[PDB]
Amino acid sequence: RQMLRKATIVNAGSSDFLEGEQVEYSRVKIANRELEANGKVGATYSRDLLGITKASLATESFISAASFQETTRVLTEAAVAGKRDELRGLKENVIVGRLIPAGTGYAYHQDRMRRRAAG
Amino acid sequence: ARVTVQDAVEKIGNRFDLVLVAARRARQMQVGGKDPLVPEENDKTTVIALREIEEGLINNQILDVRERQEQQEQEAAEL
Amino acid sequence: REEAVVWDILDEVIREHPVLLNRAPTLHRLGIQAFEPVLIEGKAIQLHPLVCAAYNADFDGDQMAVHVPLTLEAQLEARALMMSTNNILSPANGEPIIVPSQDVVLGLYYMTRDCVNAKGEGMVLTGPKEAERLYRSGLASLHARVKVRITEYEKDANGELVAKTSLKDTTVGRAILWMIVPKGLPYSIVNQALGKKAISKMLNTCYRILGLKPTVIFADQIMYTGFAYAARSGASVGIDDMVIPEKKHEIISEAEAEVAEIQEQFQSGLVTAGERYNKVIDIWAAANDRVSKAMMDNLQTETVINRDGQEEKQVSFNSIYMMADSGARGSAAQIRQLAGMRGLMAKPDGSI
Amino acid sequence: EIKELLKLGDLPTSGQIRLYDGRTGEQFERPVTVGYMYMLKLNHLVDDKMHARSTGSYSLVTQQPLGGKAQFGGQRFGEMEVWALEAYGAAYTLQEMLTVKSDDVNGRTKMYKNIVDGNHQMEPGMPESFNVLLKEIRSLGINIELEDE
Amino acid sequence: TEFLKPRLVDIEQVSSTHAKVTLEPLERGFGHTLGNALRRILLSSMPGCAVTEVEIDGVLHEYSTKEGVQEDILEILLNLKGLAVRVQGKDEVILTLNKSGIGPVTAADITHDGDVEIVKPQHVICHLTDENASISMRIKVQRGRGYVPASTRIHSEEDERPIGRLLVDACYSPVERIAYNVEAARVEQRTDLDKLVIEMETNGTIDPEEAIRRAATILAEQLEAFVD
Amino acid sequence: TEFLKPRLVDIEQVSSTHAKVTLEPLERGFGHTLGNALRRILLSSMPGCAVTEVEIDGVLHEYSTKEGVQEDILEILLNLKGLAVRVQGKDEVILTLNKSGIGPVTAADITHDGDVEIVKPQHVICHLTDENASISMRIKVQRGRGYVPASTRIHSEEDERPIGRLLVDACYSPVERIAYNVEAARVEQRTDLDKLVIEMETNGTIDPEEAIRRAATILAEQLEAFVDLR
Amino acid sequence: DIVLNPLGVPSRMNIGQILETHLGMAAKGIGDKINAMLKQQQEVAKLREF
Amino acid sequence: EEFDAIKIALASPDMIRSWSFGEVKKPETINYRTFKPERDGLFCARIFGPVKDYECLCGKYKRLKHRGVICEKCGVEVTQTKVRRER
Amino acid sequence: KPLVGTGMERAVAVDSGVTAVAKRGGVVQYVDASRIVIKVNEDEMYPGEAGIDIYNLTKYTRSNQNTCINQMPCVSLGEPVERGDVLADGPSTDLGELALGQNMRVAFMPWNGYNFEDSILVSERVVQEDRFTTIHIQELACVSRDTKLGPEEITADIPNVGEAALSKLDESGIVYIGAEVTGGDILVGKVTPKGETQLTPEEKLLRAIFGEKASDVKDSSLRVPNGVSGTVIDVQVFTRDGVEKDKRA
Amino acid sequence: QDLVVTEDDCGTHEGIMMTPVIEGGDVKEPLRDRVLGRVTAEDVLKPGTADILVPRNTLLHEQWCDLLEENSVDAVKVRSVVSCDTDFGVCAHCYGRDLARGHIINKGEAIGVIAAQSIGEPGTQLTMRTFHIGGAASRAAAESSIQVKNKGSIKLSNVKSVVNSSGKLVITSRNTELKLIDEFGRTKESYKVPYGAVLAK
Numbered sequence A: 001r002q003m004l005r006k007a008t009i010v011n012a013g014s015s016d017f018l019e020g021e022q023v024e025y026s027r028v029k030i031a032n033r034e035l036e037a038n039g040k041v042g043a044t045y046s047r048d049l050l051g052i053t054k055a056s057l058a059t060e061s062f063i064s065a066a067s068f069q070e071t072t073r074v075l076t077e078a079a080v081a082g083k084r085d086e087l088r089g090l091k092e093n094v095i096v097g098r099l100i101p102a103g104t105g106y107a108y109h110q111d112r113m114r115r116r117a118a119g
Numbered sequence B: 001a002r003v004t005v006q007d008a009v010e011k012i013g014n015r016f017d018l019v020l021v022a023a024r025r026a027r028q029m030q031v032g033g034k035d036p037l038v039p040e041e042n043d044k045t046t047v048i049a050l051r052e053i054e055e056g057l058i059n060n061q062i063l064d065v066r067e068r069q070e071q072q073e074q075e076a077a078e079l
Numbered sequence C: 001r002e003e004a005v006v007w008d009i010l011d012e013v014i015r016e017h018p019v020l021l022n023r024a025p026t027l028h029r030l031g032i033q034a035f036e037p038v039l040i041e042g043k044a045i046q047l048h049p050l051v052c053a054a055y056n057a058d059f060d061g062d063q064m065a066v067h068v069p070l071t072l073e074a075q076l077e078a079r080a081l082m083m084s085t086n087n088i089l090s091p092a093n094g095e096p097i098i099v100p101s102q103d104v105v106l107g108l109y110y111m112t113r114d115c116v117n118a119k120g121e122g123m124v125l126t127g128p129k130e131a132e133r134l135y136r137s138g139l140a141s142l143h144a145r146v147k148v149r150i151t152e153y154e155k156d157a158n159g160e161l162v163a164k165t166s167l168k169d170t171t172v173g174r175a176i177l178w179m180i181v182p183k184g185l186p187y188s189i190v191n192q193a194l195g196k197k198a199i200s201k202m203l204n205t206c207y208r209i210l211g212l213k214p215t216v217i218f219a220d221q222i223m224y225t226g227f228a229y230a231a232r233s234g235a236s237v238g239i240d241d242m243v244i245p246e247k248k249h250e251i252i253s254e255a256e257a258e259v260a261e262i263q264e265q266f267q268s269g270l271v272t273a274g275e276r277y278n279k280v281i282d283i284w285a286a287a288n289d290r291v292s293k294a295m296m297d298n299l300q301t302e303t304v305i306n307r308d309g310q311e312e313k314q315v316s317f318n319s320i321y322m323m324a325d326s327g328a329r330g331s332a333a334q335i336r337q338l339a340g341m342r343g344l345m346a347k348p349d350g351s352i
Numbered sequence D: 001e002i003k004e005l006l007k008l009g010d011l012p013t014s015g016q017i018r019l020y021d022g023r024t025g026e027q028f029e030r031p032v033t034v035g036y037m038y039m040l041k042l043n044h045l046v047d048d049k050m051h052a053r054s055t056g057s058y059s060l061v062t063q064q065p066l067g068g069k070a071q072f073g074g075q076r077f078g079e080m081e082v083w084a085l086e087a088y089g090a091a092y093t094l095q096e097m098l099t100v101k102s103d104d105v106n107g108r109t110k111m112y113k114n115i116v117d118g119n120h121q122m123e124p125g126m127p128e129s130f131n132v133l134l135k136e137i138r139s140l141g142i143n144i145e146l147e148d149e
Numbered sequence E: 001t002e003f004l005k006p007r008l009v010d011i012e013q014v015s016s017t018h019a020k021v022t023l024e025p026l027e028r029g030f031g032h033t034l035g036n037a038l039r040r041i042l043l044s045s046m047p048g049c050a051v052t053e054v055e056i057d058g059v060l061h062e063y064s065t066k067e068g069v070q071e072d073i074l075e076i077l078l079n080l081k082g083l084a085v086r087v088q089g090k091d092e093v094i095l096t097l098n099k100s101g102i103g104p105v106t107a108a109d110i111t112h113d114g115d116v117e118i119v120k121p122q123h124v125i126c127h128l129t130d131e132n133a134s135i136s137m138r139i140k141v142q143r144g145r146g147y148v149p150a151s152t153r154i155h156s157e158e159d160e161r162p163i164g165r166l167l168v169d170a171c172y173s174p175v176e177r178i179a180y181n182v183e184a185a186r187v188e189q190r191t192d193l194d195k196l197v198i199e200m201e202t203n204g205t206i207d208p209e210e211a212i213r214r215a216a217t218i219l220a221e222q223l224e225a226f227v228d
Numbered sequence F: 001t002e003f004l005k006p007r008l009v010d011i012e013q014v015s016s017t018h019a020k021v022t023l024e025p026l027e028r029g030f031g032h033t034l035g036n037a038l039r040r041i042l043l044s045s046m047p048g049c050a051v052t053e054v055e056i057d058g059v060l061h062e063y064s065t066k067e068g069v070q071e072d073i074l075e076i077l078l079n080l081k082g083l084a085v086r087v088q089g090k091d092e093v094i095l096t097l098n099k100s101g102i103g104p105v106t107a108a109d110i111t112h113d114g115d116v117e118i119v120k121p122q123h124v125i126c127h128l129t130d131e132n133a134s135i136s137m138r139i140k141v142q143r144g145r146g147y148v149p150a151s152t153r154i155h156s157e158e159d160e161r162p163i164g165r166l167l168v169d170a171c172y173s174p175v176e177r178i179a180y181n182v183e184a185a186r187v188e189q190r191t192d193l194d195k196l197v198i199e200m201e202t203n204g205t206i207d208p209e210e211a212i213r214r215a216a217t218i219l220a221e222q223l224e225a226f227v228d229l230r
Numbered sequence G: 001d002i003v004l005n006p007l008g009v010p011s012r013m014n015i016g017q018i019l020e021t022h023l024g025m026a027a028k029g030i031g032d033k034i035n036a037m038l039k040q041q042q043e044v045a046k047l048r049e050f
Numbered sequence H: 001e002e003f004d005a006i007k008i009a010l011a012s013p014d015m016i017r018s019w020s021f022g023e024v025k026k027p028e029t030i031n032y033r034t035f036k037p038e039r040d041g042l043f044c045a046r047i048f049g050p051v052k053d054y055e056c057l058c059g060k061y062k063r064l065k066h067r068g069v070i071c072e073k074c075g076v077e078v079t080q081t082k083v084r085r086e087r
Numbered sequence I: 001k002p003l004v005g006t007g008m009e010r011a012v013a014v015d016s017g018v019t020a021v022a023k024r025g026g027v028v029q030y031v032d033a034s035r036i037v038i039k040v041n042e043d044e045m046y047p048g049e050a051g052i053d054i055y056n057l058t059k060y061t062r063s064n065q066n067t068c069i070n071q072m073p074c075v076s077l078g079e080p081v082e083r084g085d086v087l088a089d090g091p092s093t094d095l096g097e098l099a100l101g102q103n104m105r106v107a108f109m110p111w112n113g114y115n116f117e118d119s120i121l122v123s124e125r126v127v128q129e130d131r132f133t134t135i136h137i138q139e140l141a142c143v144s145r146d147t148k149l150g151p152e153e154i155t156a157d158i159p160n161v162g163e164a165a166l167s168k169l170d171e172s173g174i175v176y177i178g179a180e181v182t183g184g185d186i187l188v189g190k191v192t193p194k195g196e197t198q199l200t201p202e203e204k205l206l207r208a209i210f211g212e213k214a215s216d217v218k219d220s221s222l223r224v225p226n227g228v229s230g231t232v233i234d235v236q237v238f239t240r241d242g243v244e245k246d247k248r249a
Numbered sequence J: 001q002d003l004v005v006t007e008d009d010c011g012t013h014e015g016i017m018m019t020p021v022i023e024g025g026d027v028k029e030p031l032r033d034r035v036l037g038r039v040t041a042e043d044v045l046k047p048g049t050a051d052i053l054v055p056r057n058t059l060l061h062e063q064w065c066d067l068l069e070e071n072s073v074d075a076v077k078v079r080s081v082v083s084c085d086t087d088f089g090v091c092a093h094c095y096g097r098d099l100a101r102g103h104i105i106n107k108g109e110a111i112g113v114i115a116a117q118s119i120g121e122p123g124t125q126l127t128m129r130t131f132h133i134g135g136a137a138s139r140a141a142a143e144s145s146i147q148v149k150n151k152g153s154i155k156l157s158n159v160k161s162v163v164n165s166s167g168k169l170v171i172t173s174r175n176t177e178l179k180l181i182d183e184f185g186r187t188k189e190s191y192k193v194p195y196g197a198v199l200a201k
């Protein structure tokens, strides 16, 4: 499942897809759910297989990508993109020394996500 | 319990929530000095909370209800 | 100053406080487990045998890290999530990781396994208590056929346990093990000669029928009875144990003239290096199996014991055979190299 | 040759003997191999390897405790060991190990005070290693900022 | 000699049959010394009463089957081994059991006899299937000690032995099970010190607390030969 | 209860060290019951006398070497562990040993104190090489029981630490070896009746007869606690 | 003096330790005979023979 | 402090100047004799902060009483030594 | 010695050099727990120099692994010996043969799980007989350095120290030969001079209360590492040429 | 690392058809064990379609599995992690039982980590383990003849062979699966026939 994380897209929707951007499957499904209800330009998709090493570097957390491997390259590509890591994964939270978003921490972490809705 | 905590998992369900609820209750006895419902029997605050959960006296919902009650009594006193 | 009152206070703090034990390498989550500590005089950490499997712990000098969970939350996560008792099954397969081995296996095997007649063949007892008293009195062997009346407790459609009493042929030894066996389990569980493979199933069965606390108690009981009977028996490893088959030299000279004939046919012209390599490896691989199976027939049984009158065949109580068959330690593969033929060895390339 | 030598000693050719349990006095139910093995005491004495640490000195840059018994060091809690706590639930045990037990300078003293006060509360902070990491990346000329809530 | 005597601490009586006895403090090695010595006397030397001989009318040997009776004679004899009996005066008593009709024959169907006391009158002996079936037997209870089987009785006594007298194992010893556990008694100063946990289990004819007293008494009677 | 008591029959004294003791008649099963119970006390609990402290003049520690002496101090101490001593009255006696000249220093060179008896006067302690060499030491013999090592004794009292006392291991247990054999005592009627043959092997001090008496005394003392308190 | 576990031999396939144990006992067997002859003094001729 | 996310981006020349508390002009580390930081060197106290807690270099201001008091003479802020790990 | 050997035992013990071997042989004139003097036989004895060989034995010395190196004399007073005979045994050598450990009566059988996975069950008799008892010889140094504030002093005069501790140190501040020591006992007393020690209000009030100002000096004494315990066999002092020697030096 | 149980039930019908691993005569891994502790997908009843036997979203317990064996079900669509619809994690139902607990997985459990550890461990353990412990190699290559253990009729799926002058069926397919069918018509033994094979029948 983690191998089949990403998917390439054909055509545009109401977002910035156009020809052959590689975006994660969950996020394009989210778009497709709101698109199907509202309409807008429909987007053909195709799931891509990533073998482990590249799949881990293709994660949209650059703190996880850096900690894994290829740190110099990961930080230049993130620095140039002005990438913003909102700290969703486990490795990210372990690095900043915080509660893991899992096990005991899942209760507390879901309470923080709802604190984002108000206050 | 003493040996194993399976019975207390069977009361609440989620091992993770068992730990939060036992933690919250043990903190009350640790700090507030809240009196234990079961005889202490030289048991640490960690085990007493698990006994209370096993027998079904302590629970997230019950703890919340009594927090509101003590908190409203204090509101009454301040006003 | 290590004052005497300090020891008493330290004893009071450690009570009900879990400690994490860790072994390198931590391959899977059971490489960390929580225990309730027991203060001991001496500089070595004492580890429970049954968890040695998860740590891959063997006591020829391995070391372990100790860690103290400080917060109430961390104590609770250790007692509920990471405790030894609560991590019985592995995260990979559904099979249990905590199970008796070595002595605990050897003892229960010695108890259950049957011998011909022995002291008090074909006797009638009234439950396992009479059997035990007989064995302790020294009028019955642990491996002797005896009719007993055991009362097994089988679960019904609800939570109620049904009781059933019946006469079943068994050894004295297995009857006495029934005493450890909790009510709910069938007597057929102890009625076979028990090995490590059967005892693992026994504890899994007990866990899924009865539940956690009963299996915890049952596991401890199995360990105590196993070690206590392990020292009561007296198994040893003599040089005469590994009995070599009489017919090794024949099998080998046959195999050896055969491979010789193919090497001579190599200069003639029917053979590449790969073809002859395959053919020689096949000849020796079959020879090795032959000598191994000769050793294992000659060793596994080849017990001439005179039953109550005439001669009989039964399983050998040769020490190494018992070790292998019980699954206690060596496999048939190791005992091939001891008593049979060592076989074809493989180079670092993997080519043989 | 060995069995012939045993016969010269009036010892059994099997080299197995009848043994009695010292505790019970009863005999062991089968003969046991007994003899003399030359044994060696290796340099690895428990006296030397035994070590324990509650709190001690701390490293210069990373602020984590030192390693090794000679430096009175805390045991290394490695990636491998962290993953075990991740597989479990154990999120507080892990944070402990990351923060008040290692770098978190304010946190470790504060929690020491709480444990003598018997509060058994964590009050976590920010591991000093991460503050270093930030400074090391800004020294490369990469702007790495913490964006607030 | 800095002699260090134990004292009987806790007597958990789980039941009249089963009773656990913790004992401390014991010096190192005395846990097994006293533990085993007592175990041996309590099994093979505790004196008591038990069925030795059984003569059933219309039964020539123990391998036959009597019609109207579910259990073969062997199984009936095995139930009589479990029959708990006290003789007050005599060393040997022959009790008579005559009963008929459909039902579980119990130990209460035995004709009382003044001095003899049957501890478990509800003890099952025989199940009668047909109502026309009647069972009659003369059960001999002797007093002895330890465990004397029929195999060890035929090898020693070869005097009067006519066919029909059914010999059954006679578990004189009132103690059914005994095991002792040595646990560490962390003592004021000594960690070497231990406790002895004796888990006893009789039938109810003799009290465990009194049986232990008795076993130690026999042990001290053997030490009278060695002066002090 | 047809109680059947044994009585001490024959005491073969093969030597002052080795002595065999037959015991009959014993009822069936009491052979092993008494046999092992006695063996355990006779090994672990037996009281005796042994060298605890040694102070040699001109010797600060046990690792040094004294000139004119073949053996290093450690080897001398190990020989004094093997010194067989009986104290009659007192629990603690300090014996003085002053010897000079060429020869094997034996146990007889110790000043014979009135109550104290040295069982093996020919026991070798020291070999003096040069004739000008003289050795002088004060050997303290205490009474205790079991085996009390110098390492267990260097972490207890230690109220006074005189730089010059050397602690050596003391084998207060006089019993070196013990085994019991159950043989059949073909008794008048009973063939299950048996005898107990206890083969004892001690060093000096304790008399075999006296030691068996003491061991049976200790066992009977411990039974008073169970016969008495319920 | 020492009680070693049988199950750490057939798995290990070091059978040397068991042969060492049998021979070690035989060696000590002959030492025990010489110890017995020296304890009883006996003849230098007889010791020489054995 | 408690934050939501982290971002990474190229440093502007002027961004780099923001973090800086001075330009290190000289390779001088410390004085061989008084092992204290040299003028505008790599360990300059004037730039990175005081060597000892709440104490200037020339030693005119001491104790926790003096807080953020930049010593006029040597040019060293009286704050904690911790600052030299952050500035 | 090893009861079950191979024969390489003697070769290894001799060639290692740890044993003293006789070059010349002859008869032993004088044994001692320190030295062996042999009078050489006339056939190998050269007519030039006096024909008496002296082998000095090395007594209880430290190894690199802090094990013990001790040579004991093999031969007795007045024993005839040939060239290549072992005169003194090294640390792990019996009469000429190599002796790495100790042979024992061993029985192969389980105990009550006390020999679970290779775990070993030993008799108390082994401990009593002091077989596998071993002595370690670790070397500890105390260095007196010169700092910007001033030279460090090795005096017995150490601020804030019990008389129990200073009892074991002699005039100079050095522990006595033969003295038994345990963790935390001071072996060599040393003090690090402190310049203008700016104490706080809590320390200034404390120093005022006991009045033990104890000069401008710290405590940097060499003390026994925690839990290690043994007997001082030897002390060595290395001084610079110019500085006045300690009484104990 | 990121994969965590997020939802209890995504409410998906989708899953992968699991059949019994029956390779090399003796069944290697039974279907019961393969679908022991998984959330059953699609009301799968008995042969005669006229009454539901097993429900939909239901934890396959040892009891359900024992029923499956009496009916001898071969193929079962079960809900899997791969086909779960949950965005940013997976549902307790698609996963199934926490094999370490012996009941349904708890929401919040870090599943990915356990997966990686459990795949990784055996490799790392089997490296050191078989290697120090064994010396030689005890392989057996004699893959000549298929001999069938139990009587039955030969079933050849995926096969294209030519008849040779011997009278014999010489196979020329690459993928060839000889099976052993009984009476009722179930598959019980399998046997990979190679290329260049002589078939007896």
Ligand SMILES: Nc1ccn([C@@H]2O[C@H](COP(=O)(O)OP(=O)(O)OP(=O)(O)O)[C@@H](O)[C@H]2O)c(=O)n1
Residues within 6 Å of the ligand: C024, C025, C056, C058, C060, G012, J128, J129, J132
């Ligand atoms: N270089 C090593 C050596 C050992 N180990 C771990 O420690 C275990 C035990 O090592 P060892 O005791 O040498 O192997 P055993 O299989 O126990 O065999 P034995 O002790 O009988 O030699 C190994 O399997 C492995 O998990 C390791 O990780 N890396």
Ligand SMILES: [Mg+2]
Residues within 6 Å of the ligand: C058, C059, C060, C061, C062
């Ligand atoms: Mg190991």
Ligand SMILES: [Zn+2]
Residues within 6 Å of the ligand: H056, H057, H058, H059, H060, H061, H071, H072, H073, H074, H075, H076
């Ligand atoms: Zn200034």
